Amino acid sequence: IENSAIALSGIVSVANNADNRLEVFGVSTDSAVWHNWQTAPLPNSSWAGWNKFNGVVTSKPAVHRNSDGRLEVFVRGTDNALWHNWQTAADTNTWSSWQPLYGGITSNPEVCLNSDGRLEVFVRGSDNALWHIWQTAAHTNSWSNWKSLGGTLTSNPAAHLNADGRIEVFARGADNALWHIWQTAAHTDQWSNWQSLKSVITSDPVVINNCDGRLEVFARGADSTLRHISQIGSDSVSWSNWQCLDGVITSAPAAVKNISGQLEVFARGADNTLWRTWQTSHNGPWSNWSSFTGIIASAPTVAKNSDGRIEVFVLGLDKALWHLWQTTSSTTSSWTTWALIGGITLIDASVILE
Amino acid sequence: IENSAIALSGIVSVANNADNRLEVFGVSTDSAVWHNWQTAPLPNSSWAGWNKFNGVVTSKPAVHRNSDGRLEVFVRGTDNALWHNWQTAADTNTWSSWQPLYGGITSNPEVCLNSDGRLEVFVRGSDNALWHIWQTAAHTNSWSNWKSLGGTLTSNPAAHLNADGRIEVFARGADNALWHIWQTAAHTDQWSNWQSLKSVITSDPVVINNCDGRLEVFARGADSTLRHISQIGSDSVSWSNWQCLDGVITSAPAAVKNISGQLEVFARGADNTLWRTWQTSHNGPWSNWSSFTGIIASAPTVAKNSDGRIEVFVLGLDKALWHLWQTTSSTTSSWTTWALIGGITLIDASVILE
Amino acid sequence: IENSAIALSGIVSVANNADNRLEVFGVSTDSAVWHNWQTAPLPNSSWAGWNKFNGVVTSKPAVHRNSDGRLEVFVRGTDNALWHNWQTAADTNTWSSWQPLYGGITSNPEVCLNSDGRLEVFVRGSDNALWHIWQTAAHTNSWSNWKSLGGTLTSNPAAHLNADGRIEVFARGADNALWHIWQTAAHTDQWSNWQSLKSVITSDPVVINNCDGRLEVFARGADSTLRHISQIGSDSVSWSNWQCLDGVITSAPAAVKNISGQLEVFARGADNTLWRTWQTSHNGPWSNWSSFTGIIASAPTVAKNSDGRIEVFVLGLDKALWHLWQTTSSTTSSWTTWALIGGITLIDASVILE
Amino acid sequence: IENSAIALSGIVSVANNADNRLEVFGVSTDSAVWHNWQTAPLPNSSWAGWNKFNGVVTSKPAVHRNSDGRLEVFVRGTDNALWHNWQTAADTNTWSSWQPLYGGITSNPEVCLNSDGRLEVFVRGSDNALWHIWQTAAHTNSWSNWKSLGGTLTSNPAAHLNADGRIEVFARGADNALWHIWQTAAHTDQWSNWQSLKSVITSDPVVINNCDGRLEVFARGADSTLRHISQIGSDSVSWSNWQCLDGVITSAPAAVKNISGQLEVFARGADNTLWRTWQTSHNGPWSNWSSFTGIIASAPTVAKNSDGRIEVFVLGLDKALWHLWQTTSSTTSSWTTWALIGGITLIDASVILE
Ligand SMILES: C[C@@H]1O[C@@H](O)[C@@H](O)[C@H](O)[C@@H]1O
Ligand SMILES: C[C@@H]1O[C@@H](O)[C@@H](O)[C@H](O)[C@@H]1O
Ligand SMILES: C[C@@H]1O[C@@H](O)[C@@H](O)[C@H](O)[C@@H]1O
Ligand SMILES: C[C@@H]1O[C@@H](O)[C@@H](O)[C@H](O)[C@@H]1O
Ligand SMILES: C[C@@H]1O[C@@H](O)[C@@H](O)[C@H](O)[C@@H]1O
Ligand SMILES: C[C@@H]1O[C@@H](O)[C@@H](O)[C@H](O)[C@@H]1O
Ligand SMILES: C[C@@H]1O[C@@H](O)[C@@H](O)[C@H](O)[C@@H]1O
Ligand SMILES: C[C@@H]1O[C@@H](O)[C@@H](O)[C@H](O)[C@@H]1O
Ligand SMILES: C[C@@H]1O[C@@H](O)[C@@H](O)[C@H](O)[C@@H]1O
Ligand SMILES: C[C@@H]1O[C@@H](O)[C@@H](O)[C@H](O)[C@@H]1O
Ligand SMILES: C[C@@H]1O[C@@H](O)[C@@H](O)[C@H](O)[C@@H]1O
Ligand SMILES: C[C@@H]1O[C@@H](O)[C@@H](O)[C@H](O)[C@@H]1O
Ligand SMILES: C[C@@H]1O[C@H](O)[C@@H](O)[C@H](O)[C@@H]1O
Ligand SMILES: C[C@@H]1O[C@H](O)[C@@H](O)[C@H](O)[C@@H]1O
Ligand SMILES: C[C@@H]1O[C@H](O)[C@@H](O)[C@H](O)[C@@H]1O
Ligand SMILES: C[C@@H]1O[C@H](O)[C@@H](O)[C@H](O)[C@@H]1O
């Protein structure tokens, strides 16, 4: 691989409804967003069936739950502007249809929820800088004007809350290194300057929090292995060295915190199957990669059910959505084999960044 | 103290709104519930002022946020039945007024949110058993019939979710020991038998989860010191030995997990001031108690703000509500001194259990 | 029990030879020290048989291995002075016979090895102060003059090295609280003042180091349960609060670090059997006490074999020495039942402190 | 670098005497072993001066302390056989002179102390297999016959005790991967088969134990960065995945456990200065490399003083021995600058393995 490569992304975006039922959003061959949901919040639940949102889209959809429980989806439209669509009430399958937020978008959208309940969206703009727009009141369809945070982005952005409520945003820069920028006060339009975390990454960054608060960032490196870095202090400026794990991965990674508080990472492996690694103890060393049977055609998307059980979604070779899950709420649980969520086929609508 | 004593409780119940603004509920000299809220989700925010709910009540109010963000308050009425009252929309100060759930109540109510989004209420009944009632659909004013879980209670119940979504309930039994009972499958009406955790407690139990998932229970013991016990496995049946901490406390304890993932406990101390202890490292030993200036007249009630800062509420000697908070989002932060939330005086409406 | 009680002590002192074979020292009905040793450094080894040192003694013997591998035993004589006796070569059963160190002794002796290879002995003196005497060159029969460290002792002293090489000494004071005093520079005659750790203890203190360097002290408390306190910093002045564990113990405790780095404590329990508790995780909570069959008549003495397996020695109701051990080098290993090390009967020669 | 490279080694071997004074052994331009020692066991001590052992040698010397405190040095002679030389008494500068152990040696010797007090030596033999020879009684000049453990070695061996007393040996194999072999019972001539740990290493392996017992192995990888792997169970067969740390190193690494129980690694960095990294918390992430001023011409050799302070030895550009050390017994201590241990110049006598 080359330094500027961006690894294959997940094929759906997934959210938990207010009652924790999973709901997935993807793009079909008609270039429209379709969605499907569990009928009850357990991995062995039936799914409702694929339902279409009218409208042609030009990016992967991003979804987040509002602080009042309503899901809200963001996508790039045929006019290269940002559009969004929301449930009109929590846990209800009635939606607003696509409404305009304007702007000029050159990446997939990334959404975060501030700790004061306001959604905030991050995108690469037409000048390749990071731009953002936010709800001006919690869970309300009232939005700010577009504002630039500068920089030069060569990946999609990834945003996450610090333990103290400050949003921090990660993105690859013009030198193919990982850069970041952060709120200097929680849920406030006061931001740091851009700072480099130095390495060279060949996927979008993936960010998760560990239980002692500190952010941990995962990405594929220049040698196509997983690498990761962590905050070691109480601020956004103190980071560990980068560490890599042996084993060639062929997609973006996906990270999840299991119900024992340890981190797990899933990625497509060198043999195009799903690979999994987990921390063997608190902060501990990482297990050897363990592989699941079955060739997959996307990065994994990983979610947790209402009983803590991990569930993984992938694109199959038939271009349909498949999933598997843990049989018990236990870190050593066995796993099911791939099952089909049939009814449509999916395409990768990710914005091509170069 | 005697084995059957129940330590002084907190004077208000506190919840975070959907936008994380704190809101407190207490009972005034007119025997009505009054409430007050931050105008912005920061500890140095102004408060809106005390507002009254019409209706005479006969217990401490319990409050919980629904899975759609709406606060909902539960109280015993003049007819000894359960009543409730809810925000009609998230982050809005419009309420439904008191509506009946019937039953016969002989304790303060305790509320929990199941991991499928349904509130569930636990009370001691007229036969001294544990009874419960639940929403039949998430965040909906549709409730089940009353059902008994048996047992004999001599304290108020305390409920908490396990990491796998199973509710577990703790209460003092007829032998003054701590007993517990739990769902055997997440958010399902399938329950274990009662089991004893053995000791002798002289306060209501206080339950919190640590980051690696396991529940930890705090209570005052027969010698009037703090004691605690923790889950050591992945189920509800494997517990540590009881440990005590030196230092006489004169109220129920209040526990919180700070933004570094460590536990802290607050209680009124032997000199009637607020005392604080914290874990010095992960699972680590506990610090010596540290005292704050000022005599207090209730147990503390502890909450966290949108930026992670801890805030503590107490009854003052003037029978009004006072609070203090951390100056920074940091475990070593200094603290403010007590400030008044003036406008009404408060009474302790806790149900007298004997 | 009363605040000034001193719990029953162990009946033998145990050391590892240079080749790690265990060797035990006790006092028989002739008031002489006898010793016995493993013939190979494994718990299932045969023992050589009881051999006598000529000479009448008036205290429990203390034993330590010199930095050149030779064992050396310290005891009070019929003249109330300190006497000692050493192997003339490592792993050899040829001894020097008792030689005088003079002084006036009113406690059992306590021995420590400085990190520069010099033995140092701590005793209560005729004025009830702490006195000490040391080798002036490593593993050499050249000793200093007696010197006083002051204080007023009401227990035997317990000494241990800090991670930085500073000896720290613990002893009960005139107020029945635990006091301590320490070298302010490693292996130097420069000492702190006495400082109180506050509580009230009813046994000799027992001190061990945990793997992250910090000392942890165990003792029986005024309510006859185990209590413990730990260093929380990098110096001798920063300590945790005291914690107790439920369960009445009827002897001094004995602590050991197992080969997983976790602490275990053994003590005679309320039913006069051997009880064991262990840390369930790093610094973690403590397990419920687990009991072994068989009534015992002393505190346990605990040692580790060359393969890490823990072995416990006690006085039986027949006034003989019994032991049991782990069947495998594993923290969850099963244990053998009590086996006899027959040939003599033993008496408790501990100095009666009041 | 190429897969078969072996990184530059340390220029001296270092041991602690029985009284913990450091003593270093190196080879001078006369091809003889010389040694020098601290006069007192503190890093700021004067050194005695360089003293010569008569005899021409053809390998780097290996040194270990016997279980009776006497140092003993092993080296290859002009006849390609193993020779050794020992202190005749602990802490004494009287030595036996070189005595033969025969055999045919094609690597530097590696020495370990069994947990029953017997030294054991590991070497690559004339057939490129691993061979060993051992004391038949603890700290006694009585040795076994040579015995083969098979395999094919392409590095020097590194040996370490497991927590349960089993020796485990690590060495690079014919495929340039790290292999290992272990005693299946403590201090017994019963060994496992060879097993591969898979990667590709370009230095000798370096092995250390962490406080919870488990071995951790460090080595330079094929991309010239540090990599490491750890035991995750209670046996020798359960290992983590390999992890690398960013940063090009140009020598073998040297590892030490500091007095807080955390691991630190030193290596010559890409700019030919001394680099240091440390674990920021228990098992935690690794710090960025920190560099010391001064170009160095060997790998570091690292030791600990009697007060816990770390001291580092390197070859300077003047071909003399230099060292620096921590100013205080604290993980955050500042460091001195390089100081000269003058009197001879040193050569790298490491056996050239190909
Ligand atoms: C997603 C939206 O779908 C239709 O409404 C188009 O008219 C818009 O341009 C946008 O593409
Ligand atoms: C995102 C960052 O923005 C500017 O700071 C550039 O100088 C960097 O190269 C990077 O692209
Ligand atoms: C990941 C899945 O694995 C197998 O089950 C295939 O039949 C599917 O098409 C898909 O590739
Ligand atoms: C809290 C409620 O307040 C009034 O509505 C009373 O009529 C009810 O009995 C109840 O006490
Ligand atoms: C809550 C418990 O209920 C029954 O099991 C009683 O036997 C116990 O004493 C306890 O009161
Ligand atoms: C806890 C508070 O402390 C002091 O400030 C008093 O003035 C208040 O009345 C209250 O007791
Ligand atoms: C232990 C010693 O034994 C004998 O040598 C006595 O003469 C001494 O007084 C001392 O008691
Ligand atoms: C050992 C200590 O010595 C002195 O400091 C006394 O004042 C204390 O009470 C204690 O006995
Ligand atoms: C601890 C031992 O337990 C039983 O085996 C008795 O027979 C012994 O006398 C001793 O009490
Ligand atoms: C190290 C030894 O030094 C001399 O004694 C030589 O005769 C030996 O062959 C050996 O090299
Ligand atoms: C040390 C090992 O010995 C044998 O097992 C070889 O097959 C391996 O390649 C390796 O060299
Ligand atoms: C490591 C040392 O660093 C400098 O002090 C040089 O003067 C020495 O020769 C040596 O290179
Ligand atoms: C998101 C922003 O929207 C605006 O319309 C553009 O002018 C900016 O370049 C940027 O793309
Ligand atoms: C809560 C339950 O309500 C019912 O009306 C009563 O009959 C029960 O005893 C119990 O009090
Ligand atoms: C140990 C010391 O020995 C001396 O002889 C005595 O004078 C002191 O009081 C003390 O007992
Ligand atoms: C160490 C062993 O010594 C013997 O003499 C040789 O025959 C073997 O090959 C091996 O070198």
D122 token code pair:
């590991």
Check: CB of residue B297 under 8 Å from CB of residue B276: no
Query: Nearest-CA distance from B242 to chain C in Å?
Result: 6
Instruction: Please indicate if any CB of chain C lies within 8 Å of the CB of D247.
Output: no
Count of CB atoms situated within 10 Å of the CB of B68? 24
Check: CB of residue B11 under 8 Å from CB of residue B298: yes
Q: What is the rounded CA–CA span in Å between residue D56 and residue D72? A: 17
Sheet containing C206-209: order of strands = B206-209, B215-220, B225-230, B243-248, C243-248, C225-230, C215-220, C206-209
Distances (CA, A) of D219 to D106, D245, D350: 21, 11, 18
Whether residue B338 has its Cβ less than 6 Å from ligand 6: yes
Tell me if D164 and C261 make a contact (CB, 8 A cut-off): no
> Considering only CB atoms, which chain B residues are within 8 Å of A186?
306-308, 329
Of A230, A242, A276, which to mutate for an interface test with D (greatest number of D Cβ within 10 Å)? A242
Where are the extended beta strands (E) located within C19-150? 22-28, 32-37, 51-56, 62-65, 71-76, 82-86, 99-102, 110-113, 119-124, 130-134, 147-150
Bridge-partner residues for B180, per DSSP?
A: B170, B195
Check: CB of residue C314 under 8 Å from CB of residue C298: yes
Q: Does an H or E element contain B264, and which?
A: strand B263-268
Tell me if D261 and C212 make a contact (CB, 8 A cut-off): yes
Of C213, C129, C228, nearest to C178 by C-alpha is C228
Q: What is the rounded CA–CA span in Å between residue B180 and residue A121? A: 45
Chain D neighbours among A 179-198 (CB < 8 Å)? 198
Residue with CA at minimum distance from ligand 12 atom 8: D316
How many CA atoms lie less than 13 Å away from B276 in the CB half-sphere? 23
Q: What is the rounded CA–CA span in Å between residue B222 and residue B227? A: 10
Of A67, A213, A306, the CB nearest to B165: A306
- Nearest ligand to the CA of C341 is 9
Tell me if A186 and B18 make a contact (CB, 8 A cut-off): no
> Considering only CB atoms, which chain A residues are within 8 Å of B90?
67-68, 138-139
Strand-strand pairing, C147-150 and C130-134: antiparallel
Instruction: Give every CB contact of residue D86 below 8 A, 6+ residues apart in sequence.
Output: D66, D70, D71, D72, D73, D95, D96, D141
Count of CB atoms situated within 10 Å of the CB of A53? 17
End-to-end CA distance of chain D: 16
Bridge-partner residues for A43, per DSSP?
A: none
Look up tokens 């539960």; give the residue: B74
Q: What is the rounded CA–CA span in Å between residue A198 and residue C43? A: 55
Amino acid at position A306, single letter: S
Q: What is the rounded CA–CA span in Å between residue C232 and residue C240? A: 6
Answer positive or negative: Cα dihedral of A268, A270, A271, A272. Answer: positive
Whether residue C98 has its Cβ less than 6 Å from ligand 7: yes
D322 token code pair:
């230099």
Distances (CA, A) of A86 to A20, A73, B41, D88: 17, 6, 25, 85
Instruction: Give every CB contact of residue D84 below 8 A, 6+ residues apart in sequence.
Output: D72, D73, D74, D75, D98, D99, D101
Q: What is the rounded CA–CA span in Å between residue C274 and residue C268? A: 5
C121-157 burial, b at 16+ Cβ within 10 Å, e below that, comes to bbbbbeeeebbbbbbeebbbeebeebeebebbbbbbb
Q: What is the rounded CA–CA span in Å between residue C201 and residue C178? A: 7
- To what resolution in angstroms was this structure determined? 1.6
Check: CB of residue A7 under 8 Å from CB of residue A298: no
Level-2 CATH architecture, domain D13-347: 6 Propeller (2.120)
Distances (CA, A) of B95 to B14, B72, B111, B141: 17, 9, 19, 13
**What is the DSSP track for B189-249?**
S-B---EE--S-BSS--EEEE-TTS-EEEEEEBTTSEEEEEEB-SSSSS-BPPPEEEEEEB
**What is the DSSP track for C207-273?**
EEE-TTS-EEEEEEBTTSEEEEEEB-SSSSS-BPPPEEEEEEB-S--EEEE-TTS-EEEEEEBTTSE
Query: Nearest-CA distance from A307 to chain D in Å?
Result: 28
Q: What is the rounded CA–CA span in Å between residue C164 and residue A146? A: 58
Q: Which residues line ligand 16 (CB under 6 A)?
A: D 103-104, 123, 125-127, 131, 146
Q: Output DSSP code: residue B285.
A: P
- The three-point CA angle C90-C96-C99 to 5° equals 130
Amino acid at position D286, single letter: W
Count of CB atoms situated within 10 Å of the CB of A342? 14
- Nearest ligand to the CA of B148 is 14
C249 token code pair:
């113990």
Q: Does an H or E element contain C94, and which?
A: none
B341 token code pair:
């939330």
Of D198, D199, D287, the CB nearest to A241: D287
Tell me if A285 and D223 make a contact (CB, 8 A cut-off): no
Of A252, A247, A266, nearest to A312 by C-alpha is A266
Of D274, D271, D279, nearest to D291 by C-alpha is D274
What technique was this entry resolved by? X-ray
Instruction: Please indicate if any CB of chain D lies within 8 Å of the CB of C234.
Output: yes
Ligand 9 centre to CA of A298 (Å) is: 67
Check: CB of residue D104 under 8 Å from CB of residue D112: no
Amino acid at position B117, single letter: G
* Phi/psi at C122 (5° precision): -125, 135
Tell me if D19 and C67 make a contact (CB, 8 A cut-off): yes
Query: Nearest-CA distance from D304 to chain A in Å?
Result: 25
Check: CB of residue C202 under 8 Å from CB of residue C220: yes
Q: What is the rounded CA–CA span in Å between residue C121 and residue B65? A: 64
Check: CB of residue A180 under 8 Å from CB of residue A162: no
Tell me if D307 and C260 make a contact (CB, 8 A cut-off): no
Preceding-residue numbers of gaps in chain A (C–N over 2.5 Å): none
Cα B269 to the center of its chain, rounded Å: 19
B290-317 burial, b at 16+ Cβ within 10 Å, e below that, comes to eebeeebbbbbbbbbbbbbbbbbbbbbe
Ligand 7 centre to CA of C20 (Å) is: 29
> Considering only CB atoms, which chain B residues are within 8 Å of A330?
234
Answer positive or negative: Cα dihedral of A189, A195, A197, A200. Answer: positive
Q: Where are the domains of chain A?
A: 13-347
Q: Output DSSP code: residue C294.
A: E
Check: CB of residue B151 under 8 Å from CB of residue B171: yes
D230 token code pair:
């750890």
Tell me if A186 and B330 make a contact (CB, 8 A cut-off): no
Bridge-partner residues for C311, per DSSP?
A: C303, C325
Residue of B nearest to C241 (CA): B288
Query: Nearest-CA distance from B309 to chain A in Å?
Result: 8
**What is the DSSP track for D2-19?**
-TT-----BS-EEEE-TT
Q: What is the rounded CA–CA span in Å between residue B200 and residue B173? A: 9
Q: Does an H or E element contain D299, and which?
A: none
Q: Output DSSP code: residue D285.
A: P
Look up tokens 């989700």; give the residue: B41
Of C239, C247, C282, the CB nearest to B283: C282
Count of CB atoms situated within 10 Å of the CB of D118? 22
Q: Which chains have at least 3 CB atom pairs separated by less than 8 Å from chain D?
A: A, C
Q: What is the rounded CA–CA span in Å between residue D159 and residue D204? A: 11
Instruction: Give every CB contact of residue D352 below 8 A, 6+ residues apart in sequence.
Output: none
Q: How buried is residue A185: exposed, middle or buried, by Cβ count under 10 Å (0-12/13-18/19+)?
A: middle
Q: What is the rounded CA–CA span in Å between residue C283 and residue A280? A: 18
Q: What is the rounded CA–CA span in Å between residue B249 and residue B219? A: 10
Instruction: Please indicate if any CB of chain C lies within 8 Å of the CB of B279.
Output: no
Instruction: Give every CB contact of residue B77 below 8 A, 6+ residues apart in sequence.
Output: B55, B56, B57, B58, B83, B98, B100
Own/partner pairs, A32-37, CB within 8 angstroms, 24+ separation: A32/A56, A32/A57, A33/A57, A33/A61, A33/A73, A33/A75, A33/A85, A34/A344, A35/A73, A36/A321, A36/A341, A36/A343, A37/A93
Of C214, C245, C246, which to mutate for an interface test with B (greatest number of B Cβ within 10 Å)? C246
Check: CB of residue B80 under 8 Å from CB of residue B127: no
Check: CB of residue D310 under 8 Å from CB of residue D42: no
Residue of A nearest to B211 (CA): A211
